[PDB]
Amino acid sequence: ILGGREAEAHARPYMASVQLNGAHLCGGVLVAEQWVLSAAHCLEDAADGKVQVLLGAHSLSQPEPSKRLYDVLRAVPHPDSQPDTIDHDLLLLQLSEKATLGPAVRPLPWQRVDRDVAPGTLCDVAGWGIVNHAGRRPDSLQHVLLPVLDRATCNRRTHHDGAITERLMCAESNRRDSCKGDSGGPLVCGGVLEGVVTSGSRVCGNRKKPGIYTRVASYAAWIDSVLA
Ligand SMILES: NC(=O)c1cc2cc(OCc3cccc(C(=O)O)c3)ccc2[nH]1
Numbered sequence: 001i002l003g004g005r006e007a008e009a010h011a012r013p014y015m016a017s018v019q020l021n022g023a024h025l026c027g028g029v030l031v032a033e034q035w036v037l038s039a040a041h042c043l044e045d046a047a048d049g050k051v052q053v054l055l056g057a058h059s060l061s062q063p064e065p066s067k068r069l070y071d072v073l074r075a076v077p078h079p080d081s082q083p084d085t086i087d088h089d090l091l092l093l094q095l096s097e098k099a100t101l102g103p104a105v106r107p108l109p110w111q112r113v114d115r116d117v118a119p120g121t122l123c124d125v126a127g128w129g130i131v132n133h134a135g136r137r138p139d140s141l142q143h144v145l146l147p148v149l150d151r152a153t154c155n156r157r158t159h160h161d162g163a164i165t166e167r168l169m170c171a172e173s174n175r176r177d178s179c180k181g182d183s184g185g186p187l188v189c190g191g192v193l194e195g196v197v198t199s200g201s202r203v204c205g206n207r208k209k210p211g212i213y214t215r216v217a218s219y220a221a222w223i224d225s226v227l228a
Contacts, residue, residue: 001038001124001125001127001129001131001138001143001146001151001175001177001178001179001182002004002130002144002175002176002179002205003081003131003144003175003176003177003203004131004143004144004176004217005044005142005143005206006140006142007058007126007142007143007146008143008192009011009058009141010056010058010066010103010104011101011142012124012143012186012188013030013056013103013104013105013106014030014031014186014193015027015028015029015030015057015126015141015185015186016028016029016030016038016053016054016055016092017053017054017057017060017128018025018034018036018038018042018051018052018053018184019048019051019052019053019054019069020050020051021049021050022050022052024054024128024137024181025037025046025181025182026039026042026181026182026183026184026185026186026199027126027127027128027182027183027186028053028093028184028185029108029110029130029185029186029193029196030055030095030105030106030108031058031100031107031108031109031193031223032107032227033091033096033098033099033101033107034092034095034098034099035055035094035095035147035195035226035227036040036053036092036093037090037092037093037184037196037198037216037223038090038091038092038093038183038184038185038196039088039089039090039183039184039196039197039198039199039214040077040078040081040088040089040090040091041081041183041198041199041200042091042183042184043075043077043091044083046163047211048177049125050051050132051093052069052070052072053069053070053071053072053095054067054068054069055068055069055070055099055105055207056068056102056104056105056155058063058140058141059139059140059143060128060140060162061137061139062140064074064155066102066104066105068099068100068105068144069104070096070097070099071093071094071095072093072094072095072096072098073093073095074092074093074094074137075091075092075093076091076092076094076132076226077090077091078090078091078219079109080133081223082128082152084197085200086163086198086200086212087165087167087168087170088167088214088219089196089198089199089200089214090196090214090216090222090223091184092226092227098124102155106195107194108186108192109191109192109193109215110186110192110193110223111193111194111216111217111220112217112218113217114215114217114218115164115217115218116151116215117148117168117169117189117194117195118145119147119149119150120127120143120148121147121189121190121191122146122147122148122150122209122218123145123147123148123171123186123187123188123189123194123195123198123211123213124143124144124145124146124186124187124188124189125144125147125171125178125182125186125187125188125197126141126142126143126185126186126225127141127143127178127181127182127185127197128140128141128142128181128182128183129142129144129178129180129182129183129185130179130180130181130204133205135180136142137181140200144176144178145176146171146173146177146187147171147172147210148169148170148171148174148175148189149171149172150170150177151164151166151168151170153170154210154212157210158208159208160206160209160210160212163212164201164212166215166218167210167214167215167218167219168198168212168213168214168215169187169194169195169213169214169215170210170212170213170226171210171211171213172207172210172211173186173204173205173207173209173210173211174205175205175207176205177205177206177211178197178211179204179205180203180204181196181199182197182217183197184196184197184198185197185198187213191228193216194213194215194216194217195214195215195216196206196213196214197211197213198212198213198214200212205219213227
């Protein structure tokens, strides 16, 4: 997260760290007792490498009573995801067992009605992604409040030049933004998950290149299908 602040420890009990070989790789969001939603490009070239999900965390390195590392039974990328596109960039991770729920570990309600979030709505994005251009990685969860940007402005030639489909949404990226390592994490509006940070390479904190998030409401039937 660029231009954000350290999050209040355990105030976002749905926040997951998707890990590869014991290091943070991507964000994720607990959407059911046994399921974490993240981004499909996080899984790219990770074959053989061990994927785990850390729940109940604030610090990535320090012991916390609520922290628990879960192994992954199944990793299910969206079938239409492709390495060279930002489309259908979702991944469902089935934990090895149902997560132990409590005040620091709880699934987040997610949007099932396929209607756009209104432009200007203030949404929250959290993650352990880089915090500066040098690539500094924070030990503790960071977050930033970002206003939703209307799709037509986001699609302008100077911005994302038509790449923003009805299945995607944008948020302002003026000095405050998601970045590398935040991919897969949640965009929460009014206490409901609305988007998942995309995982394609993009500049961070440049107002001319808004943040891109996959609209979960646009994938409600796929999420249901995988869990069933
Ligand atoms: N969600 C975002 O805003 C955002 C994602 C993102 C990803 C970025 O490169 C991640 C990457 C991809 C492939 C290989 C490596 C490697 O390890 O060599 C690293 C850079 C800026 C970024 N911004």
